[PDB]
Write a protein that binds this ligand. Structure first.
Ligand SMILES: [Hg+2]
Ligand code: NA
Ligand SMILES: [Zn+2]
Length: 226
């Protein structure tokens, strides 16, 4: 059940420990972005932030006030705004961040907020006992794009690397590695055959079919461009 927690942010529960939110932002489009909120021992991990500090603040305050958990952790999918737009506020709030080194480096050269701990292959952050496993399986939608697996929950936040079942466009391929994209998706499917829920960057979530679907979109793109 979708729960509007603001006129722009709405949250939806997938399990007792996991929630996926959608924040909307006018830009391009009044586009909607997805992210997660993983809770344990009154500790929250925000996975991706809303387009900015304002939205981010609203969400974090809702997690506290409503979910009765304090966001102490943050992991961005990659350096794009719908991933780290609210990192500044979080840092202001004292949040520990982890991200692919690639992301850290890009945000850096981009004068963008910088996640503070950087990993290169894979990493597991124990959200007070709860494992949040991050993996860099290759380039996709963005060169630095990662996925975060919640083993205990069997939930994959594949991020902006996966498209919802209704999607039909490859999207912004400005920072994408098109040719790598299909192989990454291959590694992802193979790596999480147990995905109960697969959550993408924009749109509704589903199951592992989101992987094969995104891969259909990309391969077709690669063919359209004979
Ligand atoms: Hg993202
Ligand atoms: Na997001
Ligand atoms: Zn992006």
């Amino acid at each position: 059940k979708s729960v509007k927690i603001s006129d722009d942010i709405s949250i939806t529960q997938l399990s007792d420990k996991v929630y996926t939110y959608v924040s909307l932002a006018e830009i391009e489009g009044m586009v909607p972005s997805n992210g997660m909120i993983v809770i344990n021992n009154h500790q929250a991990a925000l996975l991706d932030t809303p387009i900015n500090d304002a939205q981010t603040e609203t969400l974090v305050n809702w997690v506290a006030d409503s979910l009765h958990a304090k966001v102490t952790t943050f992991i961005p999918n990659h350096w794009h705004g719908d991933c780290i737009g609210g990192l500044g506020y979080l840092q202001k709030k004292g949040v520990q961040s982890y991200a692919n080194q690639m992301t850290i480096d890009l945000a850096k050269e981009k004068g963008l907020p910088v996640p503070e701990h950087g990993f290169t292959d894979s990493l597991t952050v124990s959200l007070d006992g709860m494992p949040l496993q991050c993996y860099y399986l290759g380039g996709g939608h963005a060169t630095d794009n990662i996925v975060v697996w919640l083993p205990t929950e069997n939930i994959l936040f594949g991020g902006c690397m996966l498209k919802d079942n209704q999607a039909t466009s490859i999207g912004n391929i400005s920072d994408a590695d098109v040719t790598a994209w299909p192989k990454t998706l291959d590694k992802v499917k193979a790596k999480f055959p147990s995905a109960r829920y697969v959550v993408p960057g924009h749109g509704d979530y589903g199951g592992t079919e989101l992987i094969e679907h995104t891969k259909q979109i990309v391969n077709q793109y690669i063919e359209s461009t004979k």
